[PDB]
Design a protein around this ligand. Structure first.
Ligand code: MG
Ligand code: MG
Ligand code: MG
Lengths: 227, 216
């Protein structure tokens, strides 16, 4: 499934973006994805956030969060926003944000969360923010993304990119909810090992990386619109 | 000539070995080349089919130059070995163009300082001279052009990288060793004492040379 050489190179070969001021080859757009977590009542998992950008033909992971909880929606949005602001701060060449917020069962909450994220970001820094928009009932666009047939293409595309060296972490990777307990990349590797094609091995951060990387292509570029 | 993109990668993509604890596809051999007089020193080893640089010195010549030089090469080797305990053999080549005798005394001093500090297997490149007695020096001749060509081809392909935790006591801290090496890389065609040491050190990692290295 996943190569040993590719897992090992992802760990020991990370990009030190801070070592250079020559940005010609970096993508200027930060893609992020999150899947805010509610389920019912019980103590379950958390919420995966990932932030990625292009470098030549590669994709670079700038940020990871795996967040566990008063307003769940504010805590969630704030932890996404805080990661994004640090990332923008570390990589000034980044001049646009494109954000997808999964709303699969609870789309009202994903609406509000999108709106809260755009709020913290814009309070802190001047940048254009775009959200993945999808049609709803009376055919009106709403700032959410829906997982569906996509997930298989995305998973299968990740596995193939990772195996061939296309997925890389940066050295200055931001993670306020992981870094104090683990190297975030070692944590993310534990999940990459748990990957199958398509019952209690968490997979939330890895899917978030799979999806941020996936919505990178131009096939999705019109879906992103001012929220 | 070296490609623009290869130089950029070399700058922004460095090995961090301390993130791993497995080790099965490292070489456990540190290859060191120095050419005494500046005197350039480099230390490299393998990761799979590629190469990384663990240490670099460029060392400037009261007296006892030989002792001084040996102690400089030896200090970097100690530090590099001390930071990478999976490394368990040293293969050293001391270049001897014109002064075979001094290269031989420096080999012996380097061996002594390394073995007073740490338990490790230590081999030197050997060359037969006059009486066909195998001696611990290396003679550059016409192989130099060949080492420069392979290095250009490997560097352009991305096969040669620095380690994050690169040791240099002679260059490091008013200069970044990578920067200073990059300036030499940018500069040659067919002072450069440092990039020559890196070229020859990665050239001597091939299996074809393994049999010239012996316990001295
Ligand atoms: Mg630099
Ligand atoms: Mg969900
Ligand atoms: Mg690790």
């Amino acid at each position: 499934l996943i190569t040993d050489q590719s897992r090992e190179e992802f760990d020991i070969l990370r990009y030190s973006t801070l070592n250079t001021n020559a940005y010609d080859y970096f993508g200027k757009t930060l893609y992020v994805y999150l899947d805010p977590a509610f389920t019912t009542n019980r103590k379950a998992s958390g919420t995966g956030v990932a932030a990625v950008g292009a470098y030549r033909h590669q994709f670079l992971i700038y940020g990871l969060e795996h967040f566990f909880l008063e307003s769940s929606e504010v805590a969630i949005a704030e932890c996404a926003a805080h990661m994004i602001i640090s990332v923008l701060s570390l990589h000034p060449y980044l001049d646009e944000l494109r954000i997808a917020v999964e709303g699969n069962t609870n789309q009202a909450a994903a609406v509000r969360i999108a709106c809260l994220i755009r709020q913290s970001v814009q309070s802190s820094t001047l940048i254009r923010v775009l959200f993945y928009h999808t049609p709803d009932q009376n055919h009106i666009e709403q700032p959410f993304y829906l997982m569906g047939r996509d997930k298989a293409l995305a998973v299968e595309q990740f596995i193939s990119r990772f195996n061939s060296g296309y997925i890389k972490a940066s050295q200055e990777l931001v993670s306020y909810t992981i870094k104090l307990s683990h190297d975030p990349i070692e944590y993310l590797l534990e999940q990459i090992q748990n990957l199958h094609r398509v019952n209690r091995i968490s997979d939330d951060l890895i899917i978030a990386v799979i999806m941020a990387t996936y919505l990178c292509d131009d096939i999705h570029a019109i879906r992103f619109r001012v929220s």
